[PDB]
Symmetry: D2
Subunit: 394 residues, 4 copies
Amino acid sequence: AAKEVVVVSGVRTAIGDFGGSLKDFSPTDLGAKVVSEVLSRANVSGDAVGHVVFGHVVNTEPKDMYLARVAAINGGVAQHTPALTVNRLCGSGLQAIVSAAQTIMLGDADVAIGGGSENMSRAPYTVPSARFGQRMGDAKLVDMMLGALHDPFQTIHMGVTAENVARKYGITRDAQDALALESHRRAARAIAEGRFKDQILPISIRTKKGEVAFDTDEHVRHDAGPDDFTKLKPVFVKEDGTVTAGNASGINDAAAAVLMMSADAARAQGVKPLARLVAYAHAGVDPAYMGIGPVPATQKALERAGLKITDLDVIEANEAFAAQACAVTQELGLDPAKVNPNGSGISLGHPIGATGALITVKALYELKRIGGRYALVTMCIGGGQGIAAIFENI
Amino acid sequence: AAKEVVVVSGVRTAIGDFGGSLKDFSPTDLGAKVVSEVLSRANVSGDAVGHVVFGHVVNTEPKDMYLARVAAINGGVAQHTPALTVNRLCGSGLQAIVSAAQTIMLGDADVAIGGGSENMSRAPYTVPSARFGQRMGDAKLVDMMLGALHDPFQTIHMGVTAENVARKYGITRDAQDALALESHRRAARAIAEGRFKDQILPISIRTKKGEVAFDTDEHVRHDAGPDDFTKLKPVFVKEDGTVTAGNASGINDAAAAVLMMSADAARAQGVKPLARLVAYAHAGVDPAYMGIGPVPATQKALERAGLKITDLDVIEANEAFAAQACAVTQELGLDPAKVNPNGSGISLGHPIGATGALITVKALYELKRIGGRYALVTMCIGGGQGIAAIFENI
Amino acid sequence: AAKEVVVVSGVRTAIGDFGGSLKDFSPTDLGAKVVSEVLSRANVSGDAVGHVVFGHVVNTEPKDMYLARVAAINGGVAQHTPALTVNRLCGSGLQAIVSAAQTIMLGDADVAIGGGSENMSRAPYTVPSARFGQRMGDAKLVDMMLGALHDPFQTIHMGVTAENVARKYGITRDAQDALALESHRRAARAIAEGRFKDQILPISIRTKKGEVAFDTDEHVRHDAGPDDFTKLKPVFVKEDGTVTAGNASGINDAAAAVLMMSADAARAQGVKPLARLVAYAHAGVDPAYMGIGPVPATQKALERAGLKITDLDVIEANEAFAAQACAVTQELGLDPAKVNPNGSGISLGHPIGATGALITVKALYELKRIGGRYALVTMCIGGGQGIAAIFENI
Amino acid sequence: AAKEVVVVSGVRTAIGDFGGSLKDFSPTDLGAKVVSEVLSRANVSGDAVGHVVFGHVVNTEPKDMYLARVAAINGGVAQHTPALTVNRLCGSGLQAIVSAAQTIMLGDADVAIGGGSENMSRAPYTVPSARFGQRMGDAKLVDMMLGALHDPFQTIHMGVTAENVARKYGITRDAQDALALESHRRAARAIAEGRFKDQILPISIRTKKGEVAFDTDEHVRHDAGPDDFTKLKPVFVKEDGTVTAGNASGINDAAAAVLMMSADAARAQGVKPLARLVAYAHAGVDPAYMGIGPVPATQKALERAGLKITDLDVIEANEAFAAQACAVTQELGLDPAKVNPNGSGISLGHPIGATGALITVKALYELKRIGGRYALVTMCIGGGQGIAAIFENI
Ligand SMILES: CC(C)(COP(=O)(O)OP(=O)(O)OC[C@H]1O[C@@H](n2cnc3c(N)ncnc32)[C@H](O)[C@@H]1OP(=O)(O)O)[C@@H](O)C(=O)NCCC(=O)NCCS
Ligand SMILES: CC(C)(COP(=O)(O)OP(=O)(O)OC[C@H]1O[C@@H](n2cnc3c(N)ncnc32)[C@H](O)[C@@H]1OP(=O)(O)O)[C@@H](O)C(=O)NCCC(=O)NCCS
Ligand SMILES: CC(C)(COP(=O)(O)OP(=O)(O)OC[C@H]1O[C@@H](n2cnc3c(N)ncnc32)[C@H](O)[C@@H]1OP(=O)(O)O)[C@@H](O)C(=O)NCCC(=O)NCCS
Ligand SMILES: CC(C)(COP(=O)(O)OP(=O)(O)OC[C@H]1O[C@@H](n2cnc3c(N)ncnc32)[C@H](O)[C@@H]1OP(=O)(O)O)[C@@H](O)C(=O)NCCC(=O)NCCS
C-alpha cells in the first residue's frame, strides 16, 4: 500500500488583474515568493525538501522554462532538491500538487512542494518566422496568451466550448448571469469578513507614491448589481450567444503553493497540518465540451475515496465560465451553497497555471473556517480534460 | 506495494539537424507520429490507454502548450485519455516515461505512453514589449532556443557550465575530442550495420524532387578523423577554453515514445515486451556544475535497484558535452566501451525534450541486440539536476 | 531669366502631440486633407496642377513610400499630375516648397503644390533580421522614430549636437529656458487672439463622445511659468547638461501645404495671393553642430535676395532646441521680437517632415496680420545642413 | 535662360540578386562607393561639389533616412555640400539626376552629383503595433519590400497592373516571353564582350574563401532558351495570366551615380565628358496602367528636345515587366533593336531606387560604344507615373 500524504502548509498571492498590480512580477518571482513562504509557514528547512513541482502554461521568458527550479532555488530550497514543471493547461496547479504527492506516496520523498505560477499580463508575442526568415509576404506576431485559450483541434476560443456546453446542458443567459453576480458577492463578502487574510501572502508593489501592499483580489466588483451583467453582449459567438465578458472568468496573474509530508515525517516534526490527501482522479472528454471535464473526474475521485457528493462540505470547482460551472453543479447534483462559498474564476480571476493550487488553498482554509471534514477541488481543462482531488481536514 | 511496469514497445524518429530535414514538422506532428506507431507496435488499441505524458521544453506555437493532448488525439488515442506535458529541461523525455510509469505503479492506469518531442529548428523568438508596447527606444526579439540553453541563475550558456565541470574534474581537451571522435565512429558504424533500423520510424519528407524517406540520423559525420576536432576553437569562454562545436552536442529535432503496461496487463495480453522498469532516481546539483547531475542520480538508482555498476550491460548517458560526459563516466567508474555503444548527443544530436525518451529506446533495443540484461539511462539537466532509470531486458 | 513664383494659398493642420489627437491619421490621410484644402482656398481645379511635391521622413507603412502621389490623388488632383516625395530630414517641408517652385521657375509647370506630412506617433519599429532570419542570438526591434533623431555619423541623439552648439556658442541653461518659456507664451497668445484660426484646417476626431473638432495646437502649455522649466533635468548628457525635455522641441504629427503658380498664370486667374518667392539657399555644416545650419543658409539667401537682416519683418526659424535657436538668433543678429512671433517647435511642436511647410504658412499669415513685406523661413537639419527661403507679401 | 548641364562621369555597381552577393552592403555603403568613384572619374575634388541628390525608396535602417548625406560624406564630399534624398518609386534614380541637374540649370551649383542606391535584400519588416502595443490578438510583421511593390490605391501587386497593360494593349504571353529571352541573350552577350567592364565599379565581397571581386550582373541567365520561359506559370492573377517570374524583372541590390557640371565649369576644367542633358519630362497616368507611363513622358521629352523618335540611337526603357515594356515600345513605334541593346530589368535586375541612375550610365556608355548621338532614358513608376530624359553624346 502507498504512504499517506499530509498537507502541512499552504499560501497564495492575491490575484492580479490583466495589466494590474502584479504585471511587473515574473512567474519565477511569484513562484519563489510562495515557495519561501510555505517553507516558513511549515517551519521546514529548505535543505529537507524532497521534490518541487510547479504548474505553469505560458512561458513569458527563457527563465520560465526553468520555472520550478528557479522558484525553488530563489525560494530558499537547497540545490540538491529536484524540480519539475508540469503543464496540464488550467489544471496544472492541481496537477503539480498531485505529482508532488505521488513522490511521497511512492517513497521517493517525504517532503514535497506543489504549486503553480502564472502571469498572463507578461504573456509574450512570438514570431515563428524570425529564426530562418519570412523572405517575403507579411508574417504574424502570435499572441501566446490567446493561443493558450484556443482549442488546438478546432482553433476556437475556450468560450465557444462554453457555448457548446450551455446549449447541450440547458444553461440560460439568465442562469449564467445569476452565478456570476453571486460569485462577485460571495467574494466581496469574503474580502470584507477577512476570510482570505491568512491564506494570502501580501506583495509590496513599489509604486511612485511609496510602496503599498497588494493583498486583496482586485478582479472583484464590490458594487455588483444584476444590470451590470444583463447589459453585456455575448463575446464568443455572433448568433444565439450567451457567454459574456461578465459571466466568464478573467485572465489574471498569481502564484500559490502547498508543502506536503508523509504521515510519518509530519508526526515526527510537531507540525499542525491543514489536511490530508484522500484521493484524486483524471478524465478526458470531448475537446468541444471541455467545460464538463470536472464531472467524470469528480465522480471517479469519489469512487476512489469511498465517499458521496453529500459528504463534501467544501467544493472548489473553478468557474472557468458560468456556462460550464452551472452544468457541472447541475450534472453532479451539488449544493450551490457549498460550491465556491467565496467566489471563483468569474469574480476572483483565473491565473490559469496557478488556479489549481490556489483554489486548493481556498478549499483547505474554508474547511478550517467552518470546521468541515471533506473538500473537493476540481476544474475543467482546455483540450478536453478534468482533474479532481479530495482532502480531509485534520 | 507498487505494481511492476513493463515497457512493451518503443520507437523514435531519426534525429534531424538544426534547420535540417525535420524543420517543417511541428512538435505536435512529430509527437502524434510516434504515438500512433508505439500503439501499432504494442498491438494496443487507441481506446485502451490510461495516460499519456510527453516531455517538451521549447513551445514553438500555441498548440505546443497542449502538446501531450494533441500528440495523443492525433496519434489515435481516444479522447477519454488524460494527457500531460512535463518539462525537466534535457531530462524531460525520461521524466515523461517516469511520470507515465508512476500512474501504473500507483494503480491509476494499466496502460500509459511516455514520450518526448522537440523541434529546435522551430524554436521561436518572443517580443516581450509587443503586448503593451515599447513607446520609445530599441527593443529586443528574444531567442527562446538560446534562452533554454542558458542557466537561469548566472545567465551563462550551458557550455560554460561544461567548462566548470572540465576544470573541476580534470577533463582535458584531448580527452573531450577523443570522446567526440569515438561517438561519431560508433554512430556511423551503427548506421552502416543497420542497428537503428528497427527502432526508427521513417518520415516521408515532401521534397520538390518527390517524397523521400527520412530514416537516418543526419548529424553523424561518417568520415571524421582526429584533425576535424583539433582544428576547432573553443566557443563558450574567451580564455582557456576546451569546449568546441565539435565536442558539444548538436541542437536537433526529433520525437520518441514508449508504451508501458502493468505486468498483469502484459501477462494477460501475452505481449512480447522490450523490458521492465527496475528503478529510477532524481538528483539536484550546483547549477554551475549541472553536467555531473547524472552521478548522484545514477548512484541513487543503483541503490534502489539493489544493483552495482558492474551489473550494467548497456549505458545511455546523454553526451550533452564531452566535458561532462567524460566526468560522468570517470566519477562512476564506467567502462567507456559500454557507455553509448552506438554514439550519443555529440554525433546523433540532442533534441532536448525528446532525448530522454529517445535514448531509452536506444538502450532497450541495444539490450536486445547483445542479449544484455540491465541498462542504465541517465542525463544531466540544466539548472543543476540529474535523472536516471534502470531497465531489465525480459 | 527664370519665371517668378507666386504663393496663392496655404494651409496647415493643428499640430498633434506624440500619442495625441492625430495618432489615428496616417501621413497620406493628412497629406490628402491639406492638398484638397489648398486647392479649394486657391479655387484651382485638381485637373490644372503641374506638379505635387511633399516632404516626409519616417515611413509608417508601405503607402508612405507613395506619399506625394497618394496625398495628391486622394486630395483631388488629377492622375496626370506627377508626384514626388523628398526627404531632407527636418527641412523636408521647406524643400518640398522649393522643389515645387523650381518646376515653375523652369517652366515645367505653372501650377504646383508643395507641402509636407509626418505622423511620428505612427513611426514604426523595424526588424532588420526578419527577412532572412536571425538563426540564433537575440535580435533588435529598431525604433525608426529615434533613429531619425540620431546623427548617422556619430550615432548621437540630435540633442547631443544641441549641447555642442550650446557649449561652442555660449548659450546658458538660463538662456535656453528663457526662450522656451516665452515661446509657450507667444503661442498661447496666438491661440487666444485667434491668429492661427484662418491658417488651420480643422480635423474632426471621431471620439466615443461624438465627433469633436481638433483645431488647436495641443503641445502648448498655457499655464507656463519659469519654475516649470528650471525644475527639469538635462536629458541628453549626464555631465554639464543643459538641454531638457522642456527647452527642446516636441515630437509631433501634422501636415501642411501651399499652392503656387507662375506670375502669368496667377494674373490670368484673379487669385488673391499670399506672397511671392524671393530667394532660397542651402548650406551644409559640421554634423556635430547641425543646429547652426540656418545661419549660413540665411546669409546666402539674403545675398541672392539683395536684402539685409534688417529688412525682415517676420522670421520663422524653427526652434529645434532652445540651445541652437538662441545661437541662430545671436549669430545672425536678429530681433527676437521678430523671430517666431507666435512660438515654434518648443511650444507648437516639431512634426519633422511637415515643419518646413507648416512654418512657411505661419510666416505668410503673420506677414498679412502685421502688413509686412519680407519673411524669412529657415531651419536646421540633422546630419549637418540648413535651408532658408525669403518671401514677399503682396 | 537655363544653363547647359554636362554629365562628365558616371559609374554603377554590378547588380546583385535578391539575397545575393550584395546582401551584406547597406544602401549608404553602396551609395558612398559610387560617390567616391564618380569623383575620381571626373577628376573633381570632394570639396568642389555644389549638391548631392540620391534616389532611394525602401529605408532599411535609420541611416537611410539620411542616405544622400551619408553617401556624400562617406564618399569623400565635404560637409559644406547639401544632400537630398528623393523618392519617385522606380523613377527615383533618374529623378535624382534631374533634381541634381536642376540646381545647375538654375545657377545654384556648378557641380552636382545625381545617383540612386537600393538594397532590396535588406528591405525590412515593420511592426505597426510595437510602439503602443497590441494588447490582445495576433498582429502582423509588414513586408516593406512587397509593400513598395503594391499599388497604394487598389492594393494590388505591380504585376497585376502589368496584366492590365497587357490586356489593354494586346501584348501576348508569346510576345512577353520573346522579349524576356532576348533580354537575357543581349545581357549575356554584353557581359561576354565586356561592354559593362568600364562602367562597373567592382566590389570586394569578403567570402570565407577569401575576398573575391563582384563585378558581373548575377541575375543574367547565360544559357536561356525559349522553353525556360514557356514552362513558367503566371504569378500575379489566378485567371488568364501572362506575367510570370521569368518575364518580370528581378528584385535586386545596386547603386549608381553620375557627376554633372555646368557647361562653363566643364569648358574651363577641360574635362572629356560623357554627354550633355538635352531635355526631360514627367507624366502621370492611371495607377492601374502605370506600365505605359513612359509613353507620354517620352513624347513630352521629345517635344522639348525638338527631336523625333527616329533621332534616338540608344534607348534605355526599364523592363519592369515584359508586358509593359512591349506596350511601351509598341505605342511609341520604337525599333526593338535599339531598345535596351544590352538587356534591362528582366535580365540585369531592377534595384528600384538605383535603376534610373543605373540605366542612365548604361545609356551613355552605349552611346560611346556605337558613336551614337542621342539616348532616351525612360521608365514607368508605381502609382501611375512616367519619367524621361534625353542625352546627347559629346
Ligand atoms: C470573456 C473575455 C473575452 C472578456 O475579456 P475582456 O473584454 O478583455 O475583459 P475587460 O474587463 O477588459 O472588458 C470587458 C468589458 O465588459 C464589461 N464587464 C465585464 N465584466 C463585468 C462585470 N462583472 N460587471 C460589469 N461589467 C463587466 C467591462 O465594463 C468591460 O468594459 P471596458 O472594457 O470598457 O472596461 C476574456 O476575459 C476571456 O477570454 N475569459 C475566459 C478566459 C478563459 O478561457 N480561461 C480558461 C478557461 S478553463
Ligand atoms: C556549440 C554550438 C554553440 C555550435 O553552434 P552551431 O554553429 O550552430 O553548430 P553547427 O554544427 O551547425 O556548425 C558549426 C561549425 O563547426 C563545424 N563542425 C561541427 N561539428 C564538427 C565536427 N564534428 N568536426 C569538425 N567540424 C565540425 C561545422 O561544419 C560548422 O562549420 P561550417 O560553417 O564551415 O560548416 C551549439 O551547437 C551548442 O550550443 N551545442 C550545445 C548544446 C546544448 O546546450 N545541449 C543541452 C545542454 S545540457
Ligand atoms: C527632449 C525629449 C528627449 C523629451 O521627450 P519626452 O520626455 O518623451 O517628453 P514628455 O512630454 O513625454 O515628458 C517630459 C517630461 O518633462 C516635463 N516637461 C517637458 N516640457 C515641459 C514644460 N514646457 N513645462 C513643464 N514640464 C515640462 C513633462 O512634465 C514631462 O513629464 P511626464 O513625462 O511625467 O509627463 C524629446 O522630446 C526630444 O527628443 N526632443 C527633440 C526632438 C528633435 O530632435 N527634433 C529634430 C531636431 S532638428
Ligand atoms: C515575379 C516575382 C513575384 C518572383 O519572385 P521570386 O520567386 O523571388 O523570383 P526568383 O527569380 O528568385 O525565382 C523564381 C523561380 O522562377 C525561376 N525563374 C526565374 N527566372 C527564370 C527564367 N528567366 N527562366 C526560367 N526560370 C526562371 C527561378 O529558378 C525560381 O525557381 P527555383 O526556385 O526552382 O530556382 C518577383 O520577382 C517580382 O515581383 N518581380 C517584379 C518586380 C517589380 O515589381 N519591379 C517594379 C515594378 S514597376
